[PDB]
Design a protein around this ligand. Structure first.
Ligand SMILES: CCCCCCCC/C=C\CCCCCCCC(=O)OC[C@H](COP(=O)(O)OCCN)OC(=O)CCCCCCC/C=C\CCCCCCCC
Ligand SMILES: CCCCCCCC/C=C\CCCCCCCC(=O)OC[C@H](COP(=O)(O)OCCN)OC(=O)CCCCCCC/C=C\CCCCCCCC
Ligand code: HEM
Ligand code: HEM
Ligand SMILES: CC1=C(c2ccc(Oc3ccccc3)cc2)C(=O)C2CCCCC2=N1
Lengths: 59, 22, 177, 74, 48, 372, 99, 30
């Protein structure tokens, strides 16, 4: 099945359970931050510094 | 004998985790 | 391999001689500390299923401990199994087969049962082939298959206030590890 | 008692349980629950609410009467 | 008065999102564990 | 293993009752609050300075310049309130379910409350804003009402003839240590509780139906911890200045009193009971007795039923006492003018009347209805 | 005369919805504990289950079906006659200790 | 034990013989 295939090979052992969590958390951090940053930046469009930075900077 | 793949996997968990946190 | 497995954990009664020096750690621990009156590992078999586990009789303050040693032995055998104790496990079963088929009534039972269950009578040489087949890796692969991280059927009768909660028993069916 | 085994004398009871993996986590949650929640609300409301209503009445009145006394008169 | 104002609200979003994720997941674990007791059935059988 | 065995009998296989509602979750949260206040507080004290010249600058230095200093401050400042919310839940639970029948546990409790009140009061002085200074100047001076030695007691407390640099620096010392005395007391609070076991909502001996703390109440207290964290971080990230007073962002000035002078929200009920009585000493004794009457609650108990679960009259009067406290909390927030003086007067008498007169009588009637 | 309110209060109390009799909800102390210890096997093992079931109900935040509720007329005072004697013996011991 | 059916065979079949062992449970044959 779908979920059993995860259990069988990925997290039956507690040894690999942790390796999954660690690596999953490593990816989740990149994924979530990036997403929620972009959501907040789209919510607040044009008002933050990064949006009006090109404005006052010829370098 | 049997704790070699476990201790290696926990060795990876510790290694990647210490790399994660810093 | 499951008969070999149950032979390693073995069985104990308070009338046994060996006591503290017994081979199976559960019996040794249970004899020294005097945890239980008796315990017996069973494999009840049916057509396409069965009951693989154990039975014990003990004082009302010894249930958690007995359970902890028993599950500890299952988990141990699943994850780590010495070649020596598996050879002992084989030899116990080797002796069990030849001890049981002595006299006509057990052999007549064996025939009558074998033909209904197995389909044919299995010779002792074939059994020995399957026992000699079993080594440490086979016991671990098989024990871990049937016992590691599996919900067990539990039955308690008597002064069982100490009998651990099912979640705690279920937590004991896998390891830390 | 304190320890499991020395708590108390229980006799002739049988407890049937089921593994959490065998059974469901949220069995009939919105089905049976929302009625049960409502029933519990009906049980307590009469004892719980009227003091907070009485607070709200004294609150708004007291603030109203404070604003009346604050402003000018003739 | 409040230079943290922007950063703080971003943490706010991320907190609400993450709490939105976790609260049901934790509640599910609580329900999964307590299930054993919540489904249980008590049968009294005295002798005569 | 003589530590693990303590932790086993404490938190692993302690037999808890089976039927404990979410009102028992506040005990563990109060510890989480205490640990949160300690950890946040420590990191604030790493940058904070207790001199009247620098005290304000240091707090603002934390918020502005110390990396993530603001989030640590408002976690301390709002966590202080969350600690108090949790306390008032934790105290009320025991009032309702009759948990005060564990006398020593309860009386250690009553101490734990008073120590936190002192901790949080002295904590509020530290940043050295107007309301912090003037809060201390008002609240401390109350002791001068004591008949023969109060005027001396106050000057000794302050370290001079007013609230000043002498007072601020010692208030920091007292603030940063008393939390550890609280944690020490709290372990004795728990120590008597294991002797007596834990109570359940029915008020009926649950020895017949116990369950192991782990894994049941571990995962339940974890769930509750996230709800406390949620409630904290909602305050910290969206409304950090909500519960706090604006005047404390004006630096302290002893030559200029702010008009609407008051304590923080968690003392306003007691402040309202003090303002109710016109005589100064009477106001102080009523203020004191408002808290300390908690110690008489187990003596005022009458009903043959322990818990209020099966007691309508008591339930209504209990929920009246909550509303009456919320009335006093409101009145304490408002200035001492009409009509709030008369509302405060009635509310204050009602408070002591519910506790001393009515709720005992309710229990006695409730017995007579059931042939007890 | 006013047995009604005695009946109203009984129903308003709500322990009958859990299938408890009045004396199941009595607050334990030295006298009650002693009275409960004096109870014969049947009444003890019954109150055990009545309480064990009522707690199980209280866990799930539910009550029994309406017919299974305890009746004000059929609410037996099983514990009283024992508890009266325990109290009277304690009063006697105190009155003797007085002299 | 309780009825007549199970109670059959209990009567002494032969003089008792006590067996103790290292492995096998201690029995009293006949
Ligand atoms: C990043 C660090 C990784 C930490 C990993 C820790 C870990 O392995 O967790 C153990 C894990 C084992 O529990 P089960 O899932 O019931 O058992 C399954 C075993 N087959 O326990 C937990 O993590 C429970 C999580 C609790 C909620 C988190 C707060
Ligand atoms: C809160 C509103 C509420 O739920 O009130 C009713 C509810 C009914 O509970 P039981 O009488 O135990 O019976 C349970 C029936 N299933 O009462 C609850 C009592 C909890 C009291 C604590 C509240 C403290 C508030 C602060 C005061 C200071
Ligand atoms: C720092 C403050 C406090 C901490 C950390 C604390 C901690 C605890 C904990 C962990 C429990 C067990 C879990 C629970 O039932 O909530 C408990 C129970 C209790 N506490 Fe507290 N407590 C505090 C303050 C108080 C106060 C102020 C009172 C009363 C004036 C009090 C009275 C009780 C009572 C009566 C119980 C038993 C509850 C029951 O079983 O019904 N505590 N406390
Ligand atoms: C029960 C525990 C505690 C409570 C209830 C508490 C409460 C408070 C309160 C209400 C303030 C004023 C917050 C503000 O509006 O600025 C404060 C400030 C402070 N507290 Fe605590 N506190 C506790 C523990 C601690 C501990 C343990 C320390 C150090 C170890 C500490 C260090 C400080 C410092 C340095 C300040 C000044 C900075 C500031 O105002 O934020 N506190 N505390
Ligand atoms: C002992 C105990 C604790 C408890 C849990 C954690 C404690 O210590 C802490 C651990 C971590 C953080 C804060 C406190 C102290 C008591 C509870 O909550 C409960 C909740 C209701 C069941 C009885 C009970 N018993």
């Amino acid at each position: 099945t779908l979920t059993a295939r995860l259990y069988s090979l990925l997290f039956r052992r507690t040894s690999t359970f942790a390796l999954t969590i660690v690596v999953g958390a490593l990816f989740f951090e990149r994924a979530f931050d990036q997403g929620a940053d972009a959501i907040y930046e789209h919510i607040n469009e044009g008002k933050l510094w990064k949006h009006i930075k090109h404005k006052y900077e010829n370098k | 004998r049997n704790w070699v793949p476990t201790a290696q996997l926990w060795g990876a968990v510790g290694a990647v985790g210490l790399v994660s946190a810093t | 391999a499951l008969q070999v497995a149950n032979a390693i954990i073995g069985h104990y009664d308070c009338t046994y001689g060996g006591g503290a020096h017994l081979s199976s750690p559960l019996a040794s621990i249970a004899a020294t500390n005097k945890l239980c009156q008796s315990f017996q590992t069973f494999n009840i078999c049916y057509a396409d299923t069965g009951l693989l586990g154990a039975h014990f009789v003990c004082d009302h303050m010894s249930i958690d401990d007995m359970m902890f040693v028993l599950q500890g032995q299952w988990m141990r055998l699943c994850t780590s199994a010495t070649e020596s104790e598996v050879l002992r496990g084989k030899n116990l079963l080797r002796n069990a087969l030849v001890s049981h088929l002595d006299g006509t009534t057990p052999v007549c039972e064996d025939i009558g049962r074998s033909l209904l269950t197995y389909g044919r009578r299995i010779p002792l040489a074939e059994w020995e082939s399957r026992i000699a087949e079993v080594d440490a890796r086979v016991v671990r692969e098989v024990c871990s298959k049937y016992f590691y991280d599996q919900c067990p059927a539990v039955a308690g009768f008597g002064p069982i206030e100490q009998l651990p909660d099912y979640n705690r028993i279920r937590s004991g069916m896998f390891w830390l590890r | 008692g304190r320890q499991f085994g020395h708590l108390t004398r229980v006799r002739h009871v049988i407890t049937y349980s089921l593994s959490p993996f065998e059974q469901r986590a949220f069995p009939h949650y919105f089905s049976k629950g929302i009625p049960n929640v409502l029933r519990r609300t009906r049980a307590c409301i009469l004892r719980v609410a009227p003091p907070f209503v009485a607070f709200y009445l004294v609150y708004t009145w007291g603030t109203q009467e404070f604003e009346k006394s604050k402003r000018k008169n003739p | 008065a409040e230079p943290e104002h922007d950063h703080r609200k971003r943490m706010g979003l991320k907190m609400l999102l993450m709490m939105g994720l976790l609260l049901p997941l934790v509640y599910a674990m609580k329900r999964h564990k307590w299930s054993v007791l919540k489904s249980r059935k008590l049968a009294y059988r005295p002798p005569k | 293993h003589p530590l693990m065995k303590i932790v086993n009998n404490a938190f692993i296989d302690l037999p808890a009752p089976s039927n404990i509602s979410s009102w028992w979750n506040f005990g563990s949260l109060l510890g989480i609050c205490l640990i949160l206040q300690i950890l946040t507080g420590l990191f604030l004290a790493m940058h904070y300075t207790s001199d009247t010249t620098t005290a304000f600058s240091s707090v603002t230095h934390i918020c502005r310049d110390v990396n993530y200093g603001w989030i640590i401050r408002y976690m301390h400042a709002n966590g202080a309130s969350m600690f108090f919310i949790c306390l008032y839940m934790h105290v009320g639970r025991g009032l309702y379910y009759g948990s005060y029948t564990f006398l020593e546990t309860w009386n250690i409790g009553v101490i734990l409350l008073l120590t936190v009140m002192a901790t949080a009061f002295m904590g509020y002085v530290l940043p050295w804003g107007q309301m912090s200074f003037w809060g201390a100047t008002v609240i401390t001076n109350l002791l001068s009402a004591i008949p023969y030695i109060g005027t001396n007691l106050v000057e000794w407390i302050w370290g001079g003839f007013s609230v000043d640099k002498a007072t601020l620096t010692r208030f920091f010392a007292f603030h940063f240590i008393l939390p550890f005395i609280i944690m020490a007391i709290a372990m004795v609070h728990l120590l008597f509780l294991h002797e007596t076991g834990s109570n359940n909502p029915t008020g009926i001996s649950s020895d017949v139906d116990k369950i192991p703390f782990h894994p049941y109440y571990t995962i339940k207290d974890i769930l509750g911890a996230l709800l406390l964290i949620l409630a904290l971080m909602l305050l910290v990230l969206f409304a950090p200045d909500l519960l706090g007073d604006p005047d404390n962002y004006t630096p302290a000035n002893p030559l200029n009193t702010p008009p609407h002078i008051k304590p923080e929200w968690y003392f306003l009920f007691a402040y309202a009971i003090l303002r109710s009585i016109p005589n100064k000493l009477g106001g102080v004794l009523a203020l004191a007795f408002s808290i300390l009457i908690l110690a008489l609650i187990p003596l005022l108990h009458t009903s043959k039923q322990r818990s209020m679960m099966f007691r309508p009259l008591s339930q209504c009067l209990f929920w009246a006492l909550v509303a009456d406290l919320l009335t006093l909390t409101w009145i304490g927030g408002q200035p001492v003018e009409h009509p709030y003086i008369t509302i405060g007067q009635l509310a204050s008498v009602l408070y002591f009347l519910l506790i001393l007169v009515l709720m005992p009588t309710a229990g006695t009637i409730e017995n007579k209805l059931l042939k007890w | 005369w006013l047995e009604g309110i005695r009946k109203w209060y009984y129903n308003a109390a709500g322990f009958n919805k859990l299938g408890l009799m009045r004396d199941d909800t009595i607050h334990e102390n030295d006298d009650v504990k002693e009275a409960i210890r004096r109870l014969p096997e049947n009444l003890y093992n019954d109150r055990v289950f009545r309480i064990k079931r009522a707690l199980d109900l209280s866990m799930r935040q539910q009550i029994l079906p309406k017919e299974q509720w305890t009746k004000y007329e059929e609410d037996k005072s099983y514990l009283e006659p024992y508890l009266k004697e325990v109290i009277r013996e304690r009063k006697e011991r105190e009155e003797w200790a007085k002299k | 034990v309780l009825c007549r059916e199970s109670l059959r065979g209990q009567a002494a079949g032969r003089p008792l013989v006590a067996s103790v062992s290292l492995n096998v449970p201690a029995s009293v044959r006949y």
